[PDB]
């Protein structure tokens, strides 16, 4: 009976305190959403580079007393065949992780501390034709955050060689 | 890190927009950050500078026309925005992972203009030219 956002990447505050590791991986780049509102998006496309392991971590998110936590992802993903320069093998998936924590600051980022929720695939990948005709090939994927037995958690996105634009990340519970 | 980041404060009080020849030379994978006008909350809406930022071709850049040949990139209609000025971010990458994104090539020129809010009929628009340098000049 109503949703309550814990995190919204489209709000000014919601997009603060995110960290990329390493730099030049996930980038903070202006884009637009499905409502024609200019927003901050999170993008990665290092297919002209070798051995990619790019992480993007959100700010700390409280769980409150909520039981079931959902994460809603809106993203565009490029068809590997539509990319003129590919040095290795391009991927068309990316990974969603989480890590529980009581602390919202002073937490050194460690990949091995993160639990994988799912591998994220696109129902529709876009091509040069979509680029040329200005088509918004938006994918929507909803997942649930695993057991959170701390005060809150961090979410993380892992890229291993895909061409992915995260248009929207929204974490919420229902009342 | 290795790339360079450029900050452009896009308002009519910036003397770099004066002659209409404001340009920057960037490399592929460089960053451009454009900041919207920002004011103390005590300043009324009507006395604040607001606009839409467009990427246009050379013709649109010359004539200050975004209609036939332009794409909206950013909206500066929050002069009192929390956490400071609204910030448009661009990365000059070869290939976009965003189906409505923009791609850049070494050796080419790109153009931005702004259209005021509320709309006047002026043709004295603020504008910026971006030259993406050849690969040889960027190591
Ligand atoms: C309009 O633009 C000027 C710059 O031309 C802005 O002043 C700069 O603000 C930044 C960040 O606050 C400082 O680091 C610079 O030193 C300032 N001036 C210069 C000379 O670069 C000014 O804030 C803008 N005005 C509005 C209304 O936002
Ligand atoms: Ca120059």
Author numbering:
A (entry chain A): 27 to 201
B (entry chain B): 27 to 165
Question: What wording appears in the published article?
Answer:
The Eph receptor tyrosine kinase family regulates a variety of physiological processes in the developing and adult organism, ranging from tissue patterning and angiogenesis to glucose homeostasis and bone remodeling, while its dysregulation has been implicated in diseases such as cancer.
The human EphA3 LBD was crystallized in complex with the receptor-binding domain of the human ephrin-A5 ligand and the structure was determined to 2.26 Å resolution with an Rcryst/Rfree of 0.19/0.21, bond/angle residual mean square deviations (RMSD) of 0.004 Å/0.78°, and no Ramachandran outliers. The crystals contained one heterodimer in the asymmetric unit with a well-ordered interface. Thus, EphA3 binds ephrin-A5 in a manner similar to EphA4 but different from EphA2 and EphB2. In contrast, the pronounced tilt of ephrin-A5 in our structure brings the ephrin ligand closer to the ABR loop (R indicates the EphA3 receptor and L indicates the Ephrin A5 ligand) and burying a larger surface area (as calculated with Protein Interfaces, Surfaces and Assemblies (PISA) and Shape Correlation statistics (SC) software). The EphA3 C strand lining the bottom half of the ephrin-binding pocket is remarkably twisted, which enables extensive contacts with ephrin-A5 residues outside of the ephrin GH loop. One consequence of this larger twist in EphA3 is that residues S49-V58 from the C strand are brought into contact with ephrin-A5 residues located below the ephrin-binding pocket. Ephrin-A5 inserts its GH loop into the well conserved ephrin-binding pocket of EphA3. Nine residues of the ephrin GH loop penetrate the ephrin-binding pocket of EphA3 forming contacts with seventeen residues of the receptor, and six of the nine ephrin-A5 residues interact with EphA3 through salt bridges and hydrogen bonds, consistent with tight binding. The strategic placement of L111R, which caps the ephrin-binding pocket, is unique because in all other Eph receptor crystal structures a proline occupies this position near the edge of the ephrin-binding pocket, leaving the pocket open.
